[PDB]
């Protein structure tokens, strides 16, 4: 999972993206 981060950029930044998304 993690697509929600790149799809939101700064809106996706958060511990979730930090651990589930290499995009923030």
């Amino acid at each position: 999972v993690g697509e929600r981060c790149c799809k939101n950029g700064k809106r996706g930044c958060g511990r979730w993206c930090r651990d589930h998304s290499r995009c923030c």
Side-chain angles (χ1 to χ4, degrees):
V1 291
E3 48 165 36
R4 118 89 177 159
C5 199
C6 306
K7 276 267 282 282
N8 259 295
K10 281 185 124 283
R11 296 226 297 202
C13 264
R15 42 179 57 259
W16 188 87
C17 176
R18 206 209 271 225
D19 218 62
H20 302 75
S21 296
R22 291 292 304 279
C23 214
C24 250

